[PDB]
Ligand binder design. Structure first.
Ligand SMILES: CSC[C@H]1O[C@@H](n2cnc3c(N)ncnc32)[C@H](O)[C@@H]1O
Ligand SMILES: N[C@@H](CCN[C@H](Cc1c[nH]cn1)C(=O)O)C(=O)O
Length: 259
């Protein structure tokens, strides 16, 4: 009940900060600072307990749902801002970016992806760290898909700056449109994708029998800055590991073939 205020305050701020950042590139610092606070807020044990204590299903669910959407748009823009800034000759980071760009290597596991493997990232974004960091680290081919053309465009330009000689392709194709989906060994889903589990189910018959999927997600209080986990259809995708990260904004669920 008491916490309710904070979330509605965040929702209003994120709504205001987003509209302001679009029309004027002066309120960037404000948005980045807001996301740095939000990132810290969801990793605070105090507010986690307060959040979990709150019950009222309908109202809470709608509030979480409303927060998921606005923060989705904010992450998109914060990536665009970082992309434009790098292209303008200035590397940068934030509390938010520093949090997530840590354990991108060991999302599947330590020394899991080899040189011969091929990773597919669903929802690459304007600043595709995952593509760049995996490509340079493992020396593997990596693909990125995004429904946003701005993300595709900037993504290609950023890849060209940071990893020009690595095998990195980004398109606006869907999993069904990908020609060499059968050769894909690893698949990462971005947390903030509302159709990620819908595309998971689809990818079963498209992918080979040795494929492994890393689904980024956030349950409980993290669900305000993430789309949560879900049950998967029986005798298809099997959750072999749920990787909770108490100091990171998103957790990881590993899916493999049932046989
Ligand atoms: C900013 S990182 C998140 C990215 O995922 C992308 N995204 C959201 N939903 C989907 C989807 N269903 N398929 C592919 N990419 C998506 C968004 O366009 C955004 O750039
Ligand atoms: N561009 C990024 C992909 C987007 N990263 C976000 C991180 C996040 C989770 N919650 C809030 N922010 C996501 O995984 O949904 C990459 O290359 O990993």
């Amino acid at each position: 009940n008491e916490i309710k205020l904070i979330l509605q305050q965040y929702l209003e701020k994120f709504e205001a900060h987003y509209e302001r950042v679009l029309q004027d590139d002066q309120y960037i610092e404000a948005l980045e600072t807001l996301m740095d606070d939000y990132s810290e807020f969801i990793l605070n044990p105090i507010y986690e307990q307060q959040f979990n204590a709150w019950r009222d299903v309908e109202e809470k669910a709608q509030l979480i749902k409303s927060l998921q959407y606005i923060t989705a748009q904010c992450v998109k823009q914060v990536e665009v801002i970082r992309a434009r800034r790098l292209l303008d000759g200035q590397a940068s980071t934030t509390g938010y970016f520093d949090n997530i760009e840590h354990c991108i290597d060991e999302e599947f596991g330590q020394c899991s992806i080899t040189s011969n493997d091929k990773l597919l990232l669903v929802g690459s974004g304007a600043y595709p760290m995952t593509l760049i960091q995996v490509a340079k680290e493992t020396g593997a081919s990596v693909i990125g898909i995004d429904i946003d053309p701005q993300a595709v465009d900037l993504g290609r330009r950023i890849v060209n700056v940071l990893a020009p000689n690595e095998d990195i392709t980004i398109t606006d194709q869907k999993v069904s449109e990908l020609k060499d989906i059968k050769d894909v060994t690893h698949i990462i889903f971005s947390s903030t994708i509302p159709l990620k589990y819908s595309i998971l189910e689809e990818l079963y018959d498209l992918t080979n029998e040795n494929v492994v999927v890393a689904m980024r997600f956030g349950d409980g209080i993290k669900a305000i800055f993430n789309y949560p986990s879900q049950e998967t259809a029986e005798d298809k995708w099997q959750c072999v590991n749920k990787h909770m990260r108490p100091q990171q904004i998103f957790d990881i669920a590993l899916y493999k073939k049932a046989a």
